Amino acid sequence: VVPDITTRKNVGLSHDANDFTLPQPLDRYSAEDHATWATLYQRQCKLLPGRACDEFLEGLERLEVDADRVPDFNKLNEKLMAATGWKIVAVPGLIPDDVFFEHLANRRFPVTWWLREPHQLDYLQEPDVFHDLFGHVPLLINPVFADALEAYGKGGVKAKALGALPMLARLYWYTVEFGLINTPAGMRIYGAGILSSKSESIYCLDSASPNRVGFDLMRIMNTRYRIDTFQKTYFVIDSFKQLFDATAPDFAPLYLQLADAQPWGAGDIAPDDLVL
Ligand SMILES: [Co+2]
Ligand SMILES: [Co+2]
Numbered sequence: 287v288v289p290d291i292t293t294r295k296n297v298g299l300s301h302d303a304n305d306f307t308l309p310q311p312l313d314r315y316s317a318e319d320h321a322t323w324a325t326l327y328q329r330q331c332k333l334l335p336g337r338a339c340d341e342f343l344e345g346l347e348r349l350e351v352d353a354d355r356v357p358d359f360n361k362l363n364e365k366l367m368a369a370t371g372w373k374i375v376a377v378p379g380l381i382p383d384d385v386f387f388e389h390l391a392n393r394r395f396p397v398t399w400w401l402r403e404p405h406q407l408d409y410l411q412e413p414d415v416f417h418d419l420f421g422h423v424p425l426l427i428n429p430v431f432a433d434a435l436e437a438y439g440k441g442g443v444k445a446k447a448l449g450a451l452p453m454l455a456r457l458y459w460y461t462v463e464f465g466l467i468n469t470p471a472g473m474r475i476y477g478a479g480i481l482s483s484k485s486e487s488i489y490c491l492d493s494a495s496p497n498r499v500g501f502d503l504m505r506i507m508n509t510r511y512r513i514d515t516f517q518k519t520y521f522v523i524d525s526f527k528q529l530f531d532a533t534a535p536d537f538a539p540l541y542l543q544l545a546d547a548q549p550w551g552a553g554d555i556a557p558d559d560l561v562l
Contacts, residue, residue, distance in 0.1 A: 290412075291400075291410075292378060292379035292380070292400075292412060295314075295378075295379075295400035296378045296400070299311060299378070301377065305385060305388070305389070306377045306378065306382075306385055306396070307377055307396075308376050308377070308378065308399070309376065310358070310359045310399050311376075311399060312358065314399075314400070315355075318403075318404060319356055319401045321404075322401055322402065322403070322407065322416075323352075323354075323355060323356045323401060323415075323416060324353065324354045324355070325404075325407060326407065326482075327351075327352075327353050327416075327420065328353070329484065330420065330481070330482065330487075331346075331353075333487055333488075334481065337474065337475055337487050337488075337491055338475050338481055338487075339467050339469070339474040340474070341425060342424050342476065342481060344424075344427075345423070345427045345428070348365065348369070348424075348427055349362055349365045349366060349369075349423065349424060349427060350365060351423070351424065356401060359374050359375075359376060359397065359419075362419075365427075366423070366427065369426075369427040370426060370427060370428075370429050370432040371393055371432075372393045373395070374395045374396075374397045375389065375395070376396075376397060376399040377396040377397065377398060377399070378398070378399070379398050379400075379413065380398075380412065380413060381396060383442070383451045383452075383455055384442060384446050387438065387439045387441065387446075387451075388439065388442055389439065390436060390438055390440075391436065391440045392439070393432070393436055395422060395423060395426060396418070397415060397418040397419050398412070398414050398415055398417075398418045399415055400414060400415060401414050401416060402414045402416065408484050411513070411514065416482055417479070417482040418478075420481070420482055421478030421479065421481045421482035422462070425476060425478075430525075430526040430529075430530050431476075431526045433530050434532075437533035438454065438462075438533065441454055442454065444538055444541075445537070448538060448541050448542070448545075449545075450537075450545070453507040453508075453541055453544055454507070456506055456507050456508075456510075456511060457507055459511050460506045460509065460511065460519075460520075461476075461477070461506075461521065461523070461529055462477065462478060463477050463478055463479040463480075464477035464490075464511075464517050464520060464521075465520070465521060465522075465523060466491075466498060466520045466522045466523070467522065467523050467526075468522050468523070468524055472491075473491055473562075474491075475487060475490060475491070476523075476526075477520075485516075486516050486517075489516055490520055496516070496517060496518055496519060497518065497519040497520070497553070497555055497559075497561065498519075498520050498522050498561070499521050499522065499555070499559045499560060499561055499562065500560030500561075500562060501522060501528060501532070502521075502559070503532045503540070504540060504543075505550070505556055505559065506521055507540065507541075507544055508544050508547055508549045508550055509549060509550045509552070509554075510549050510550060510551055510552050511552050518553035519552060519553065519554075522562055
């Protein structure tokens with residue numbers, strides 16, 4: 287057993303014991319880190335036109351996400367706060383789900399502060415600052431998307447009280463992390479896990495292999511996912527409004543009905559799916 291990357295990167299740093307935040311450690315970014323950031327940024331910006339939803343590419347520009355260095359979170363926050371009242375907060379790496387949703391409930395988006403090493407350029411399993419900031423943050427300037435996230439966050443309390451955090455986590459995964467959005471110009475991507483990826487960005491739109499299924503709240507909350515492979519199923523929304531509107535009803539009876547149900551496997555098609 288050797289220390290994992292999260293442990294190694296955080297040596298000598300602390301974090302709040304309750305909310306897991308710390309000030310962004312600006313001094314810890316090396317020349318190599320800025321170069322790695324610049325390489326990832328350039329790679330994604332070459333790949334994503336015609337694949338990412340237009341709002342994502344626009345958000346990168348409106349927030350002035352740096353092309354050439356790891357961004358200063360405080361500086362980005364000036365723009366994000368003026369747009370939708372959100373801010374990003376630095377965290378050490380993966381945090382508990384209850385803490386994560388509590389941040390979202392308060393319009394704080396947690397971002398892992400450290401970056402993958404150059405040898406991990408192609409892929410990192412852990413979240414890092416490229417995935418969290420480049421992948422997740424640009425859409426937070428869209429007020430409908432931002433409201434959906436806040437609503438997910440507020441749902442954390444009820445989910446925790448009912449032992450249903452994993453059901454809310456599935457909704458988050460299949461929307462915020464791996465969601466597709468249909469447009470008159472064809473299918474586009476809004477999931478951050480795809481937007482920061484070297485290759486999943488290609489597969490999710492070009493391959494006949496994955497299922498593309500119309501968004502359905504109950505179906506999604508009853509669907510397993512895997513973290514270590516490309517998604518076998520992507521869920522497709524018509525608009526960010528659909529995401530927000532999905533949060534309108536009381537989730538409590540949905541959780542209880544699902545508590546004793548057998549969940550769908552990551553690759554299953556349910557009898558009632560709208561398959562696209
Ligand atoms: Co700790
Ligand atoms: Co993510």
